[PDB]
Every structure is written in C-alpha cells, then in structure tokens.
Amino acid sequence: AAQTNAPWGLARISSTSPGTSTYYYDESAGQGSCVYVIDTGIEASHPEFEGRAQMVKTYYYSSRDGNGHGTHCAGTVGSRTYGVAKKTQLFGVKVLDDNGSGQYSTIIAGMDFVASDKNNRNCPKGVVASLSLGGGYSSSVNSAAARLQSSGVMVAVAAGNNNADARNYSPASEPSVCTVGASDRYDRRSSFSNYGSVLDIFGPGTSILSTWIGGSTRSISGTSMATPHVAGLAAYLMTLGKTTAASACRYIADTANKGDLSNIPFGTVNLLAYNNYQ
Ligand SMILES: NCC(=O)NCC(=O)NCC(=O)O
Ligand SMILES: [Ca+2]
Ligand SMILES: [Ca+2]
C-alpha cells in the first residue's frame, strides 16, 4: 500500500533516504495487534481512529484527554492519515493529568495495569505499550517498565528532551525496554533529543503532524513523538509475524537504516527505524 503526501516521518520510516513523501507499507497495517498509549488519554471519538481507539483506565476523575498530547501520540501509532500501523487497536491509559503531569506512583500503576490487562483483550498478533513520558531516574519506575516488558508487552519509551544522556531519566534508562530518540527531516538528531548508550533506536520527532483533540490536527515535536513511531512499527512487524514482543526492539535495531544520522554523539547508536518495505 502507498500513502502519498504522508507526514514526513511516515515517509521516512519506509525510505532509505530523507526527503520523500510517500509512506509505503504492507496493507495488513497492524491489524490484530494492540498498542496501549500511556499518557493524557485518547479522544476515542476522533474520526481518524475509525472506532479502533478505546480508553481502558484512568487515574483521574475523567478518562477524557483534556490536553491533546495523548491523542497526538495515539494518532502517530495508528490513525488513518498520521499513523504507522493504520489498523491496530489503540487502548488509552490516562496516567497524566490535563497539564501533562503525573506522579511516579501513577505512572507505575498504569504500567502494572497494562501488564495484567492485555491478555484479556483481543490482541492475537501481540501487544505494544507506548510511554511518551518520563522524569528523573527512579529504580521503581524502571522496574515496573521491565516487568511490563517481561509480561509480554513490547515497551517503547521516550529518551527525553534534555539534550543529555538518557541514563539519568526514567523509564528511558531501563535497558530491557526500547528507548527511542528523535530526529528531524534532515536526518539530524533533534536539538532536544537525549542520547547515550541506553538508546536503542531513533525515529522522527521534530515537527510531527498528528491528531489533536476536537477532531483536529497539530504538529508538535519531542521524543514523545518519536516513541509512537516505534510503537506503531513494532505493532506492524508483529502483525506480519517478523518479530514478537520479546525480540522486537532488537529486530527493529538490526533492520534499521544504519549510519544515516548526524548530530549523533560517539557511543550512541546511529539507527533509524525502518519498515524494510519494497
Ligand atoms: N513526573 C513525571 C511527569 O509527570 N512527566 C511529564 C511528561 O512526561 N509529560 C509528557 C512529555 O513531556 O513527554
Ligand atoms: Ca540511507
Ligand atoms: Ca534497550
């Protein structure tokens, strides 16, 4: 399948070179997989989700995405026009309030919820979780992310936006999950993206067009935008059967475009997520 005039990051994950604008992908499109977006919520009624989005848990007095951030991330995972995996199932877990903030206890609770919930959902091709959030280092946060991975979920996490080493942030610093840095349309690591040996992969994160609340769209930047590219790619590869949750990060790293990025500090991977279509 081919989506012409796609957002630049979708085109980039299906190309070996920057500057193209068609997103090429297998029509299976992540059907039968599921991605939990652990964030501010998801506006499930948004037409771009085509009924494939559902809120499953909130830690606040409403499950509504009153911010937009979670809806944006979900759209990069799986919306019709802005998504990597255009037929996956999206599940929303609201751990951040409508200012985009959350206590570590709440983030841990949300991860634990996904660990115990996902086998009760219709996800024959596998389960991903996208964590477009983080804070300062916490052993308990890292442990919860590692247990979520070990429960059978492909966990993708944002590296963080400090232009610093991701080993000082959580859950980015948990080695057993997939830690995602951000790039711009010219194949440069994004100005704000964290780096370091703990990064597994980079994906598009600067000026990412996706869904927004109110049935709308918005372009924003961050490692929170790169993470859902990887989560959606994992869902897509799991539906094709080329990997499973346990090996998905390593498989994505091994099949990535290698050496294409600039502004990559020595010792950080130079790997850009790539779907190997065509
Ligand atoms: N104490 C952790 C926290 O609340 N982090 C805020 C956060 O990650 N918001 C989403 C983002 O900035 O990517
Ligand atoms: Ca290249
Ligand atoms: Ca890792």
Residue 268 is part of a domain; what is its CATH number? Answer: 3.40.50.200
175 is in an annotated binding site: yes
Ligand 3 (ion): residues with CB under 5 Å are: 175, 200
- Dihedral angle at the C-alpha atoms of 198, 102, 77, 271, nearest 10 degrees? -10
- Nearest by Cα to 73 from 35, 101, 104, 19: 35
Instruction: Report the amino acid identity of residue 181.
Output: G
Beta-strand (E) ranges in 13-99?
Answer: 23-24, 33-39, 53-58, 89-94
- Resolution number, Å: 1.4
Q: What sign does the CA torsion over 156, 204, 160, 41 have?
A: negative
Cis peptide before 171 (omega within 30 of 0): yes
Residues 6+ apart with CB under 8 A from 31: 87, 88, 125, 239
First to last CA, the chain: 10
Query: For residue 257, which ligand has an atom nearest its CA?
Result: 2
Ligand 1 pocket, residue 152 CB under 6 Å:
no
- The crossing angle, in degrees rounded to 10, of helices 69-78 and 223-240 is 30
Q: What sign does the CA torsion over 40, 216, 201, 155 have?
A: positive
Q: Residue 179 half-sphere exposure, CB side, CA atoms within 13 Å?
A: 29
Of all protein residues, the one whose alpha carbon is nearest to atom 10 of ligand 1 is 133
3-class DSSP state of 74: helix
CB atoms within 10 A of CB 172: 31
Pairwise CA distance, residues 8 & 41, whole Å: 25
Residue 69 — φ and ψ, nearest 5°? -60, -50
| Cβ–Cβ < 8 Å for 250, 262 | no
Buried b (16+ CB within 10 A) or exposed e, 234-261: bbbbbbbeebebeebbebbbebbbeebb
Both structure tokens of 264: 């990559």
Helix ranges restricted to H, the chain: 8-13, 69-78, 104-117, 139-150, 223-240, 248-254
Domain count within the chain: 1
Q: Which structural domain, as residue segments, surrounds residue 59?
A: 1-278
| Cβ–Cβ < 8 Å for 9, 38 | no
Q: Which atom of ligand 1 is nearest to the CA of 224?
A: 13
Determine the Cα angle at 212 with ends 162 and 157, to 5°.
35
Size (the chain), residues: 278
Pocket test for ligand 1, best of 60, 98, 101 (most atoms within 8 A of CB): 101
Tokens 């590869």 locate to: 237
